[PDB]
């Protein structure tokens, strides 16, 4: 029966406004027949496959409630998403159990046939944790990014809860009863991980569709291991509440100075890019909230200039790995706490280059050609000068009080 | 060590999160004492001690890294009592007392481990009948447990952030019901209780001396409710007084209106509200076997009879009185000393479904004690035999049966803490009499379902991996 | 209703070189409009060169009427062209 044509007539009659009609005995017989064919649950899986091959989300819910392995088969979710389907159907399939690998393959499919609705439906399952208030799109290889996708992911407090229909659940309840009788007889999102998605630009985030009002409350944006080249300035001013911005392992070529215009930026990380050959921070920009700065493994050939006037209260200045020739301009960061110039080309530090930084505690200068150590602040606690040509312990380090 | 635990993601609902690694580069901080003594080879039964140390570090969030102390005391962290017991288990000196690895994983597989948040014992062990949470979202996240211990009443006050409590006797006789009312416009908050003397007393939470006494009734007050206004009152002779929220500030206040829903042969036990917002103007109450509803005008708008239940259900359980009424799309009814739950509809005023908790329980006395609902379509059934049931309102089926944590569940409130998080307090008995107040995470049913699906997916992955390797 | 004259304008523009996708649009219209749009669905040229739904729609449109002389020959020319484009089309 289910082999030849049972679905083609049953779904047609039960979905053609079978409710809202004084056909109580009629529905009773159809549900009796349903409970009769409900045995041999393999057949139920066949019915689900046929009910998904067509776009009839009214009865798929009933099949799922009676118990149908949504991970039966090109799995079901990839099939439904390949052909043009309805958001209700993919939602009902995601709510029921379906393998994560299948959902990932379905996301790739829906990425191919660009459809914001199914994309958001899937990302709300793969990469959203409401407890943490974080989007976790890390490593999905989404070659692009569109605000129309991340739209419904953000809470969007205007939305509410409404039971659109209940006919499927009641239908499921009565067929289950008949089978039993036959047997007896605020809270915004504060993170957005887009790392390692093989991006190439984020220009599509500008006056975004309902995402602009939500980016104003972001407090972290991991964009690392992508391949960007710039950071859109309109995004810099929109992100009015960031504290942690990550841009390492991208492909940058010059430091965007306007990054330091963000109202609350406090941990900037542009490392392992090809930035160079010199970072010049513009004196008109005053960033008193930047309490970390990682310019490691770039191609810098100087210390970032104007660092005292611009990044006033800096704590950790990490310039490891760059090719810095040799310091000549004294740092004036009154609040520095950890300097790191390891793996550079320095051969001699200027005799008063660290005298005007009275809070230095850590100072790493490995893998240089250092031979003499100049006057150091007395607060220096850790001092890691390794692999760097000292013929004798300097006299300036034997007098460090702590 | 944590140095050997790699993380492949940070999304909680991921199939693969943590892995193990041995870089091949024991450690003093992370070794068993038997291993430190140079006694024998490492052995399986010492890895469990190392794993207990790792669990301690995860619980304390790496605090120890930067004879083990109390995790909650030495460092700041939420209790998580099931894991504290597991830690104290797998860190015992005698290695024969350490659980085997399969057992450790088996007890790490329970949703009651993730969801149980705080478990507080009461040392006095007094029979605690009622309790009311503090509707204040301030630092005074506390309860106001009412109980009966003498010819007069017993008044506890258990603070959550402190886990210590103060007891008092400020009523003239035992109390049966509590209620709290907070008027932010006047910044006044009062705790009103129903005393078996046959009166009502007010105690202002701002000052322990600001006390009043209210109008007297011939029987003992059995239930109270505050609607957010008007203060609902309920006696045992079928009386329904309304108290204005503001008028009760003064002593000897007057009831704005009084209805006699019923008679002395029928007590009024439960008053509730409709969960759906479209029906926010109906309050339901059970006077004996009458499921009556009265509108915002305090006039009865429907009057069902429950004596019809004996025609289908057993007469023995039918001729009891109503305990609770859980208002939703369908009315949920619990009757005294009855293991069966009745489901009614508002419109047709007739029975729609029955729930035989004995089936679920025997599948594992089974007397029903309390009913609670969450808008997530999970109705929590607290059975007097000390077992909680989780029913899904869409299918009316079992989710999981929670037991072996108390012997007799007394009451079960839903409440919020000062961290804006919603929890479900379960005050249960422990007759070895001892009263234990477990504070469950409101997401217990979702946790059960998600963890089941998650462990099944991981089992499938491991099975497939074993097959392709062979 | 305007989709008929819209497909007429489409038939007008397909003669221009480098008409390139518009195949999904006209496919959705044909799935929406069974009779009138299919009468001009002969304008469907080599587009998309893998969705089985498109071929199913084509054959189902041909069979649903199966009594109009011109649409039969037009659809046969179309299916001949697309099978010449891909031999895997014959399997499906
Ligand atoms: C490159 C690499 C090489 C080797 C191993 C390794 O752990 N091998 C291993 C050797 C033996 C054993 C079993 N023995 C246990 C001891 N026992 C005394 C004898 C039996 C096991 C075990 F997993 F089964 F336990 C593993 C791991 C890595 C890694 C990595 C990696 C990947 N991502 C990151 C990110 C940061 C850092 N590392 N990292």
UniProtKB/Swiss-Prot annotation, chain A:
Tissue expression pattern: Expressed in pyramidal neurons in all cortical laminae of the visual cortex, in neurons of the substantia nigra pars compacta and caudate putamen (at protein level). Expressed in neutrophils (at protein level). Expressed in the brain. Expressed throughout the adult brain, but at a lower level than in heart and liver. Also expressed in placenta, lung, skeletal muscle, kidney and pancreas. In the brain, expressed in the cerebellum, cerebral cortex, medulla, spinal cord occipital pole, frontal lobe, temporal lobe and putamen. Expression is particularly high in brain dopaminoceptive areas.
Post-translational changes noted in the entry: Ubiquitinated by TRIM1; undergoes 'Lys-48'-linked polyubiquitination leading to proteasomal degradation.
UniProt similarity note: Belongs to the protein kinase superfamily. TKL Ser/Thr protein kinase family.
Subcellular location as annotated: Cytoplasmic vesicle; Perikaryon; Golgi apparatus membrane; Cell projection, Axon
Assembly: Homodimer. Homotetramer; when activated by GTP-bound RAB29. Interacts with PRKN, PRDX3, and TPCN2. Interacts with VPS35. Interacts (via N-terminus) with RAB29; this interaction is direct and stimulates kinase activity. Interacts (via ROC domain) with SEC16A. Interacts with APP; interaction promotes phosphorylation of 'Thr-743' of APP. Interacts with MAPT. Interacts with RAB8A, RAB10, and RAB12. Interacts (via N-terminus) with RAB32.
LRR repeats: 188-209, 217-238, 241-262, 264-285, 289-310, 313-334, 335-355, 361-376, 379-401
Outcome when changing residue 125 to M: In PARK8; uncertain significance
Parent sequence residues shown: 666 to 1197 of 2527
Annotated domain remarks: The seven-bladed WD repeat region is critical for synaptic vesicle trafficking and mediates interaction with multiple vesicle-associated presynaptic proteins. It also mediates homodimerization and regulates kinase activity.
Disease: Parkinson disease 8: A slowly progressive neurodegenerative disorder characterized by bradykinesia, rigidity, resting tremor, postural instability, neuronal loss in the substantia nigra, and the presence of neurofibrillary MAPT (tau)-positive and Lewy bodies in some patients.
Function: Serine/threonine-protein kinase which phosphorylates a broad range of proteins involved in multiple processes such as neuronal plasticity, innate immunity, autophagy, and vesicle trafficking. Is a key regulator of RAB GTPases by regulating the GTP/GDP exchange and interaction partners of RABs through phosphorylation. Phosphorylates RAB3A, RAB3B, RAB3C, RAB3D, RAB5A, RAB5B, RAB5C, RAB8A, RAB8B, RAB10, RAB12, RAB29, RAB35, and RAB43. Regulates the RAB3IP-catalyzed GDP/GTP exchange for RAB8A through the phosphorylation of 'Thr-72' on RAB8A.
Originating species: Homo sapiens
From Swiss-Prot, chain B:
Cellular localisation: Cytoplasmic vesicle; Perikaryon; Golgi apparatus membrane; Cell projection, Axon
Effect listed in the UniProt record for changing residue 312 to A: Decreases WD domain homodimerization. No effect on kinase activity
UniProt-annotated binding residues for GTP: 74-97, 263-266
UniProt-reported outcome of changing residue 358 to M: In PARK8; shows decreased WD domain homodimerization; no effect on kinase activity
Effect of residue 22 to A: Loss of kinase activity. Decreases proteasomal degradation of MAPT. Loss of phosphorylation of RAB10
Spans of repeat WD: 115-159, 164-204, 209-244, 249-295, 301-345, 365-392, 397-441
Tissue expression per record: Expressed in pyramidal neurons in all cortical laminae of the visual cortex, in neurons of the substantia nigra pars compacta and caudate putamen (at protein level). Expressed in neutrophils (at protein level). Expressed in the brain. Expressed throughout the adult brain, but at a lower level than in heart and liver. Also expressed in placenta, lung, skeletal muscle, kidney and pancreas. In the brain, expressed in the cerebellum, cerebral cortex, medulla, spinal cord occipital pole, frontal lobe, temporal lobe and putamen. Expression is particularly high in brain dopaminoceptive areas.
UniProt effect for mutating residue 17 to T: In PARK8; uncertain significance
Outcome after substituting residue 324 to I: In PARK8; shows decreased WD domain homodimerization; no effect on kinase activity
Post-translational modification: Ubiquitinated by TRIM1; undergoes 'Lys-48'-linked polyubiquitination leading to proteasomal degradation.
Domain of life: Eukaryota
Binding-site residues for ATP, renumbered to this chain: 3, 6, 21-22
Domain remarks: The seven-bladed WD repeat region is critical for synaptic vesicle trafficking and mediates interaction with multiple vesicle-associated presynaptic proteins. It also mediates homodimerization and regulates kinase activity.
Disease linked to the protein: Parkinson disease 8: A slowly progressive neurodegenerative disorder characterized by bradykinesia, rigidity, resting tremor, postural instability, neuronal loss in the substantia nigra, and the presence of neurofibrillary MAPT (tau)-positive and Lewy bodies in some patients.
Function: Serine/threonine-protein kinase which phosphorylates a broad range of proteins involved in multiple processes such as neuronal plasticity, innate immunity, autophagy, and vesicle trafficking. Is a key regulator of RAB GTPases by regulating the GTP/GDP exchange and interaction partners of RABs through phosphorylation. Phosphorylates RAB3A, RAB3B, RAB3C, RAB3D, RAB5A, RAB5B, RAB5C, RAB8A, RAB8B, RAB10, RAB12, RAB29, RAB35, and RAB43. Regulates the RAB3IP-catalyzed GDP/GTP exchange for RAB8A through the phosphorylation of 'Thr-72' on RAB8A.
Family of this protein: Belongs to the protein kinase superfamily. TKL Ser/Thr protein kinase family.
Protein's name according to its UniProt entry: Leucine-rich repeat serine/threonine-protein kinase 2
Organism: Homo sapiens (Human)
Gene that this sequence comes from: LRRK2
């Amino acid at each position: 029966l289910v082999h030849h044509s049972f679905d083609l007539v049953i779904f047609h009659q039960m979905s053609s406004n079978i409710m809202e009609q004084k056909d109580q005995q009629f529905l009773n017989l159809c549900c009796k027949c349903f409970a009769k064919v409900a045995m041999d649950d393999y057949l139920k899986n066949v019915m689900l496959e046929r009910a998904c091959d067509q776009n009839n989300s009214i009865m798929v819910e009933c099949l799922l409630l009676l118990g149908a392995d949504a991970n039966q088969a090109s799995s079901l979710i990839c099939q439904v998403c390949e052909k043009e389907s309805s958001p209700k159907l993919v939602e009902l399939l995601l709510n029921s159990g379906s393998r994560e690998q299948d959902v990932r393959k379905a996301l790739t499919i829906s990425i191919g046939k660009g459809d914001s609705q199914i994309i958001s439906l899937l990302l709300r399952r793969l990469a959203l944790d409401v407890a943490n208030n974080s989007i976790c799109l890390g490593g999905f290889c989404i070659g692009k990014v569109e605000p129309s996708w991340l739209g419904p992911l953000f809470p969007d407090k205007t939305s509410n809860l409404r039971k659109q229909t209940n006919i499927a659940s009641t239908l499921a309840r009565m067929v289950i009863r008949y089978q039993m009788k036959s047997a007896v007889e605020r809270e915004y999102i504060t993170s957005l991980d887009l790392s390692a998605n093989e991006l190439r630009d984020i220009d599509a985030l500008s006056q975004k569709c309902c995402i602009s009002v939500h980016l104003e409350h972001l407090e972290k944006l991991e964009l690392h291991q992508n391949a960007l080249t710039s950071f859109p300035q309109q995004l810099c001013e929109t992100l009015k509440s960031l504290t942690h911005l990550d841009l390492h392992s991208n492909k940058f070529t010059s430091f965007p100075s306007y990054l330091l215009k963000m109202s609350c930026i406090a941990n900037l990380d542009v490392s392992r890019n090809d930035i160079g050959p010199s970072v010049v921070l513009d004196p008109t920009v005053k960033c008193p909230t930047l309490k970390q700065f990682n310019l490691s493994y770039n191609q810098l050939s100087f210390v970032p200039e104007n660092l005292t006037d611009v990044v006033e209260k800096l704590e950790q200045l990490i310039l490891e790995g760059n090719k810095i020739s040799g310091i000549c301009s004294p740092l004036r960061l009154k609040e520095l706490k950890i300097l790191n110039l390891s793996k550079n080309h320095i051969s001699s530090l200027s005799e008063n280059f660290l005298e005007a930084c009275p809070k230095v505690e850590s100072f790493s200068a490995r893998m240089n050609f250092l031979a003499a150590m100049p006057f150091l602040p007395p607060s220096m606690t850790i001092l890691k000068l390794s692999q760097n040509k000292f013929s004798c312990i300097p006299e300036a380090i034997l007098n460090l009080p702590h | 060590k944590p140095h050997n635990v790699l993380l492949f993601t940070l999304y909680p609902n991921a199939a693969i999160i943590a892995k193990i690694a041995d870089y091949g580069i024991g450690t003093p901080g992370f070794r068993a004492p038997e291993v430190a003594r140079g006694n024998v080879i490492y052995n399986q039964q010492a890895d469990v001690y190392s794993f207990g140390l790792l669990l301690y570090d995860i619980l304390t969030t790496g605090g120890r890294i930067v004879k083990l102390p109390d995790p909650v005391k030495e460092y700041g962290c939420a209790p998580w009592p099931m894991v504290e017991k597991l830690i104290k288990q797998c860190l015992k000196e005698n290695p024969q007392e350490r659980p085997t690895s399969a057992q450790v994983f088996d007890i790490l597989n329970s949703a009651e481990l993730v969801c149980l948040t705080r478990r507080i014992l009461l040392p006095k062990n007094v029979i605690v009948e009622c309790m009311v949470a503090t509707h204040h979202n301030s630092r005074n996240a506390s309860i106001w447990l009412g109980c009966g211990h003498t010819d007069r009443g017993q008044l506890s006050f258990l603070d959550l952030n402190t886990e210590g409590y103060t007891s008092e006797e400020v009523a003239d006789s035992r109390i049966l019901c509590l209620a709290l009312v907070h008027l932010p416009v006047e910044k006044e908050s009062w705790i009103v209780s129903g005393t078996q003397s046959g009166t009502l007393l007010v105690i202002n939470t701002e000052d322990g001396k600001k006390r009043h006494t209210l109008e007297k009734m011939t029987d003992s007050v059995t239930c109270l409710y505050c609607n957010s206004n008007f203060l609902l009152v309920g006696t045992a002779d079928g009386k329904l007084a309304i108290f204005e929220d503001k008028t009760v500030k003064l002593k000897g206040a007057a009831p704005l209106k009084i209805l006699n829903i019923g008679n002395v042969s029928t007590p009024l036990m439960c008053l509730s509200e409709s969960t759906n917002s479209t029906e926010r103007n109906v309050m339901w109450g059970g006077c004996g076997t009458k499921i009556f509803s009265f509108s915002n005008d305090f006039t009865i708008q429907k009057l069902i009879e429950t004596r019809t239940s004996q025609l289908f259900s057993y007469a023995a359980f039918s001729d009891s009185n109503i305990i609770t009424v859980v208002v939703d799309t369908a009315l949920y009814i619990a009757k005294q000393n009855s293991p069966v739950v009745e489901v009614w509809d508002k419109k047709t005023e007739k029975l729609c479904g029955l729930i035989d908790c004995v089936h679920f329980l025997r599948e594992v006395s089974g007397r029903v004690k309390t009913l609670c609902l969450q808008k997530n379509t999970a109705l929590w059934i607290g059975t007097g035999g000390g077992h909680i049931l989780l029913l899904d309102l869409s299918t009316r089926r079992l989710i999981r049966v929670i037991y072996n944590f108390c012997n007799s569940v007394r009451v079960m409130m839903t409440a919020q803490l000062g961290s804006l998080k919603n929890v479900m307090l379960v005050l249960g008995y422990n007759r070895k009499i001892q009263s234990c107040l477990t504070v469950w995470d409101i997401n217990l049913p979702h946790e059960v379902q998600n963890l089941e699906k998650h462990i099944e997916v991981r089992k499938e992955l491991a099975e497939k991996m074993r097959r392709t390797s062979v | 209703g305007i989709q008929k004259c819209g497909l007429k304008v489409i038939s007008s523009i397909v003669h221009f070189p480098d008409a390139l996708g518009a195949m999904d649009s006209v496919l959705h219209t044909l799935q929406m409009y069974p009779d009138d749009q299919e009468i001009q669905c002969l304008g469907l040229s080599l587009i998309g060169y893998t969705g089985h739904l498109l071929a199913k729609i084509l054959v189902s449109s041909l069979y649903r009427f199966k009594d109009v002389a011109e649409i039969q020959t037009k659809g046969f020319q179309t299916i001949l062209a697309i099978l010449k484009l891909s031999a895997s089309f014959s399997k499906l």
